[PDB]
Design goal:
Oligomer: part of a larger assembly
Largest sheet of chain B: 8 strands, mixed
Enzyme class (chain B): hydrolase
GO molecular function (chain B): ATP binding; ATP hydrolysis activity; ATP-dependent protein folding chaperone; protein folding chaperone; RNA binding; unfolded protein binding; WD40-repeat domain binding
Subcellular location (chain B): Cytoplasm
Largest sheet of chain A: 4 strands, mixed
Distance between the termini of chain B: 12 Å
Strand order of the largest sheet of chain A: 5-8-7-6
Largest interface: A-B, 28 and 36 residues
Catalytic activity (chain B): ATP + H2O = ADP + phosphate + H(+)
Helix content of chain A: 40-55%
Binding site for ADP (chain B): 28, 80-83, 147-148, 400, 485
Distance between the termini of chain A: 10 Å
Number of strands of chain A: 15
Structural class of chain B: alpha/beta
């Protein structure tokens, strides 16, 4: 400060300006990133590799700002993304939008608590009236449509057109195997992206899909006792002496054969422990391969940790470098453990089917990684939006036909509840228009034009914005029934969530 | 360099001001929490007077001096410390004028004294003897909690706060020493906070279903493992020589089952019946088969326990820490009235609860484990001090600075000196008092002006302690409000503010030393 | 365009005013000092008086325009305390600024001044009493009136002569004296000396031993148009344009000269008798060379250069009337003061017209060789004459020496403005502005302006004590008992003139350049 002491970068103006303004910075694109999104975002992640998406959290985590303002709220956006797969595209914009009313009320001179608390009780009032606007509930996981109907909404809230083949393909991955009652799992259903085939060739093989080359034979048994190992081959040939191969002419003789019998004992000890599939994040060797061909134990030549991880995760396997006779601790899990060609890529396939614990493994055949990973992104955040763990998701208008109802609900009521809080309560019903704007953003019209008509749709729950021109000229697309609703819950959090950090990040002048 | 005479204090006055502004709301539920980046480079949020000081790396000597002196009071109260910064420099803002009018800072330091004493006298005359009712404790707890966190957050947490202190006064302890154990726990939300009259261990060892649900818990806290090692060489014995390794291979696996079946004995020694779950608790690891050989018998063995727990468990259960197992009666291994290993997330947090003489009450908070959950970890222990202070003093008054006016009124209304020299100081003295309640109101709402001339005329009308409504900005009876100044709390700021202002108000030469 | 507005704009104002007033703290009372002012004339102007200093040479300020009104106003309505007013207002502003530094509205600070003044007004109405208009009771005030304006040693040597002039009244109702001020000045061997003369003195006379040195029965013929003309209240036209007109001009003028001097000498015989009384000719213009010694030897005293102010004071003082002319006329019209005495002091011939039918005109002969001294003392006489008259015009006199200012500050005891707290500040700001004079003296004296002042209040709060800082040693004493008294009309008028400008300050939040 004035004094050489007082560590801080936040406060006073730079709070009522820069913090909120820095909060404004990132919500800018989240607008283009939520609901139907025609917008796209190049990102290099410190691979210098471009990637394209509409999602903030993928990007924001990378982005580094002086100020915890940005650094905090993402956690809530994560806290959403943790609990709810999508809407996080939205979860940031409303707070940042709702915030900047304060700095205005600060120019209008409204106190911290005064500005805060109006949003609060209105947020409770929201949390009171928000479930009143539950317009449906989900029903059946076994039904593909009942699932896929919703799933578009989040895929929509990532990317618009693709959602159709996708949402179906998702419940066709059997979101249904899990009850979605107190349980559901990504890693069991895990996306596995095959570069090649088509992007709409993205398929479903229930049970593990490992793009890794499937070696040896097929597993000794399909129940396979599965000993997965980080690097069970560090080489059994040693790299030593002169040439980084040999030094003395007598050296080479012992280098070549030693790999064999060690790996022979190693792959015998794979059979000795009884592993019916051998998984080497370490190298593949033809002898060991032929040993794995002799002992008939299916071989995995190379592993991402994700391989080992999931194998460690799902099978109950434990990946360990073995220069060491393998010992089954990993043991088995999956009742059918296969070789397969999916995308006609050699696909390491383990499968076991259980109401909980079943791997129903999303296999994305795809033409482009940079797409198929963003194609993964929406289905990810779509099935994570499928993750509610209420089979009946108490659905509310998806793509936000809600806000117009609530923008009507609160600020009207907002004045009824009196005192300067009312203005914060009335400011509360404003930033609803964000996604109606944020779609009209990527749709290309004015939120006023939107809201004026979508106030003129009055009590609806249905008509609202979207993509194309029906979010433009009428600003009317049925966001109850385009087939698009959203769960009350993912909605319920964003208000609740974006209530907290927004309220919070204002309070802090240091 | 030298900042000479008036200049040296001109530095002192300034460094007080801008920080006082931060704390005009660091205080009350109106009080605004403040965050720290450059204090570390971490993302850090805190509300409290002294801690924020230490958290920041504070280059300015004044602040650098203050963090130490406000500590001693922040040691005791924890609230009123977020208050304390105001009155001090504000008094500088008072007196500097008088020396700017011209006068000795001497006579004003002098002048503060008798005013401090009448205050101290008034502090007696004001302090309201109040009872130990948990209600009376709640409002003292929550007012500090309300100061430090949301009144809601104050409310929801207040119960467990005023609860443990009852069991720590069950010890007839005048203060809070144990039952200070706080536990942050993996959760999506900091919403969840629980009051464990006993303790909580975080581990079930590594083995589930040991009869980990334990109604009758005879607590073996054993800092020695049942896991010494399953391999050839001992736990601390390492050998790269060959012949010495073949020596330990045989009995290393044995000395486990030595200690294992000691417990297997100790189980039947303690119990004779698997019915009562016998709780083994290890500061270090325990072998799976050790657990297995124990778990099957119904022995619940815990490993990797914490030394404070070991301390706590020894004390709370009437428990014992042991370097051996052998055989012992149930009571030789202290008793927990209830023990339940509780899995949340992955980790199974053993609830060892209502230990015999549950001398340590674990206050468990389930949250995101952010500094947000740390942000509520303070007000509690802070409020603990406050109720401990309220436990300390039966004499507690309305908060919200109702005392300030009634101080500033009487102390100024009469000349305690019937002099200039002291009254000059006295004038400045009791003036810096009112800074807090008016600015609180002024920060809340109605300006310093009305609330004062309210509360003054009100006190003038009353003599009741009437104090600001921090959600209104005009006074109420803070006895009725619940915001309550412990005489233990409120007294020490009079010490600090004066005693700090004494020598710092007298400096002329200042220089780099060394 | 370029506009200064609101809070930051009024700063320069209150920075100026409070900054401009603090220099006058060197003034107001004998422990304060005469302040030296210099002009483009290079004149060293030594006045502890605010007005003199204020309206002559200063630094450009927007407040410099407004302050020039009030020290004039208090000089106008009193003649005293023009130095007083200035130090109160910024002291109130310094107070007021704090509350505005508190952000509390200049409007809410403005609107609280007025009751507070009324309070003190009513209070100064309470602490006033009707005192004597007695010369000695005026000395009590004259000592006090002069010192807070002019110097004490001057005050003392002025105290007797100042009162004597304003005591010479017929019981006029005038708060200041028009004709009791007749100021004769001189280059002396005393840089400061003042003679006290009742009646009128002439600017210049003409003294001859032929003329009567002492005219006891004085029929004063006081004339503008002079001896060079003949039965004329109006001068006669000259033509130097041509030769033959000028040729006839210089011959007949002596007839205008002769008849005129004849007009007096035959009229002295008529009016004053032959040698029986003394005669007085006043020539407000030059005196003819023939008529000079001719009026001289006839018993007539012809007086060269009496003013038009001598003209009017004489008529009023001596009860006669000044003429334009020397023509034969009754003695009564011709001015008669029971003494005409031409007193030549220095190089200047001062003709007393004394034993005047009205001692309305009374004269003070100032002395100094040094003009700055002649400036000071000649200026030092007037304020008291105006001030101390406010004691002898008014049956009431307010007690001085700041004893009454400590008296209201507590008598302003607060939450008496329980109204809002803006008036409570308006009184709280005002209670402190009262004390700036009791401050500035103990200030200008030893010890503390405060430690004594709080003694004063701690004392004054004690019963029976209206007590105040000494104007000299700065020590506590009861002021009304010392007789130290500022004029009654000062305070009540002072408070109004004090508060209004400071009130005007807060209503101006905008200044446009």
């Amino acid at each position: 400060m004035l004094k050489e002491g007082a560590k801080h970068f936040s406060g006073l103006e730079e709070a009522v300006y820069r913090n909120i303004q820095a909060c404004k910075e990132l919500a800018q694109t989240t607008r283009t990133a939520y609901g139907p999104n025609g917008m796209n975002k190049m990102v290099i992640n410190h691979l210098e590799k471009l990637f394209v998406t509409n999602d903030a959290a993928t990007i924001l985590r990378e982005l580094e700002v002086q100020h915890p303002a940005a650094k905090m709220i993402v956690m809530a956006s994560h806290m959403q993304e943790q609990e709810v797969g999508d809407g996080t595209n939205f979860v940031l914009v409303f707070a940042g939008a709702l915030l900047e009313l304060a700095e205005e009320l600060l120019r209008i001179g409204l106190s911290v608590s005064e500005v805060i608390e109006g949003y609060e009780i209105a947020c409770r009032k929201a949390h009171e009236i928000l479930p009143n606007l539950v317009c449906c509930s989900a029903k059946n996981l076994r039904d593909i449509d009942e699932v896929s109907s919703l799933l578009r909404t989040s895929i929509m809230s990532k990317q618009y057109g693709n959602e159709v083949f996708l949402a179906k393909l998702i419940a066709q991955a059997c979101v249904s195997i899990f009850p979605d009652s107190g349980h559901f799992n990504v890693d069991n259903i895990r996306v596995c992206k095959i570069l090649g085939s088509g992007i709409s060739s993205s398929s479903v093989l229930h049970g593990m899909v490992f793009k890794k080359e499937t070696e040896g034979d097929v597993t000794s048994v399909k129940d396979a006792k599965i000993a997965v190992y980080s690097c069970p081959f560090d080489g059994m040939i040693t790299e030593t002496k002169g040439t980084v191969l040999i030094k003395t002419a007598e050296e080479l003789m012992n280098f070549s054969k030693g790999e064999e019998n060690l790996m022979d004992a190693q792959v015998k000890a794979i059979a000795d422990t009884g592993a019916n599939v051998v998984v080497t994040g370490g190298k593949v060797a033809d002898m060991a391969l032929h040993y794995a061909n002799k002992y008939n134990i299916m071989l995995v030549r190379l592993n991402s940790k994700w391989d080992l991880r999931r194998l460690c995760k799902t099978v109950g396997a434990t990946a360990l470098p073995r220069l060491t006779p393998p010992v089954l601790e990993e043991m088995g899990h999956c009742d059918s453990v296969y070789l397969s060609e999916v995308g006609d890529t050699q696909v390491v396939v383990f499968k076991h089917e259980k109401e909980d614990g079943a791997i129903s493994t999303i296999v994305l055949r795809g033409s482009t990684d940079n797409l198929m990973d963003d194609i993964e992104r929406a289905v990810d955040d779509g099935v994570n939006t499928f993750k509610v763990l209420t089979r009946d998701k108490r659905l509310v208008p998806g793509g936000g036909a809600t806000e117009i109802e609530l923008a009507k609900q609160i600020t009207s009521y907002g004045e009824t509840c009196p005192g300067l809080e009312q203005y914060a309560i009335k400011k509360f019903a404003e930033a609803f228009e964000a996604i109606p704007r944020a779609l009209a953003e990527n749709s290309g019209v004015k939120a006023n034009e939107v809201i004026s008509k979508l106030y003129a749709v009055h009590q609806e729950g249905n008509k609202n914005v979207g993509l194309d021109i029906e979010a433009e000229v009428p600003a009317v697309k049925d966001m109850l029934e385009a087939g698009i609703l959203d769960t009350y819950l993912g909605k319920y959090w964003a208000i609740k969530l974006a209530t907290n950090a927004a309220v919070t990040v204002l309070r802090v002048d240091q | 360099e030298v900042a000479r005479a008036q200049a040296a204090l001109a530095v002192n006055i300034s460094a007080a001001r801008g920080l006082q502004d931060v704390l005009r709301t660091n205080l009350g539920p109106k009080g605004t929490m403040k965050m720290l980046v450059s204090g570390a480079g971490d993302i850090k949020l805190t509300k409290d007077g002294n801690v924020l000081l230490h958290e920041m790396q504070i280059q300015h000597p004044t602040a650098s001096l203050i963090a130490k002196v406000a500590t001693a009071q922040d040691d005791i109260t924890g609230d009123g410390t977020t208050s304390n910064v105001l009155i001090i420099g504000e008094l500088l803002k008072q007196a500097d004028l008088y020396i700017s009018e011209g006068l000795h800072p001497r006579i004003i330091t002098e002048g503060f004294e008798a005013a401090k004493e009448k205050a101290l006298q008034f502090l007696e005359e004001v302090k309201v003897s109040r009872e130990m009712d948990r209600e009376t404790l709640i409002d003292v707890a929550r007012t500090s909690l309300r100061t430090k966190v949301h009144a809601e957050l104050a409310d929801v947490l207040t119960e467990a706060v005023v609860d443990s202190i009852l069991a720590i006064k069950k010890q007839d302890e005048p203060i809070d020493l144990f039952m200070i154990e706080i536990m942050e726990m993996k959760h999506k939300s900091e919403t969840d906070t629980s009051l464990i009259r006993g303790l909580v261990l975080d581990h079930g060892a590594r083995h589930p279903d040991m009869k980990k649900r334990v109604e009758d818990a005879y607590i073996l806290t054993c800092n020695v493992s049942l896991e010494y090692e399953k391999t050839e060489v001992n736990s601390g014995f390492f050998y790269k020589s060959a012949e010495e390794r073949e020596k330990l291979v045989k009995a290393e696996r044995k000395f486990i089952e030595d200690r294992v079946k000691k417990i297997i004995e100790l189980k039947r020694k303690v119990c004779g019946d698997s019915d009562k779950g016998f709780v083994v608790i290890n500061q270090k690891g325990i072998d799976p088969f050790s657990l297995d050989a124990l778990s099957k018998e119904g022995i619940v063995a815990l490993r990797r326990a914490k030394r404070r727990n070991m301390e706590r468990l020894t004390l709370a259960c009437g428990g014992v820490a042991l370097n051996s197992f052998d055989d012992l009666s149930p009571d030789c291994l202290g008793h927990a009235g209830l023990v339940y290993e509780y899995t949340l997330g992955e980790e199974k947090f053993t609830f060892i609860e209502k230990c015999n003489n549950p001398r340590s009450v674990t206050l468990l908070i389930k949250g995101p484990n952010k500094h947000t959950l740390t942000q509520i970890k303070d007000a509690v222990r802070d409020g603990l001090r406050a109720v401990k202070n309220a436990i300390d003093d039966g004499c507690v008054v309305p908060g919200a600075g109702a005392v300030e006016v009634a101080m500033a009124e009487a102390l100024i209304k009469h000349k305690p000196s019937v002099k200039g020299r002291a009254q000059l100081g006295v004038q400045a003295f009791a003036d810096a008092l009112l800074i807090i309640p008016k600015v609180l109101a002024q920060n809340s709402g109605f300006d310093l002006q009305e609330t004062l001339v309210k509360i003054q005329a009100e006190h003038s009308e009353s003599g009741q302690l009437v104090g600001v409504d921090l959600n209104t900005g005009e006074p109420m009876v803070a006895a009725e409000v619940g915001v309550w100044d412990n005489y233990c709390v409120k007294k020490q700021l009079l010490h600090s503010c004066t005693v700090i202002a004494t020598n710092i108000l007298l400096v002329d030469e200042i220089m780099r030393a060394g």
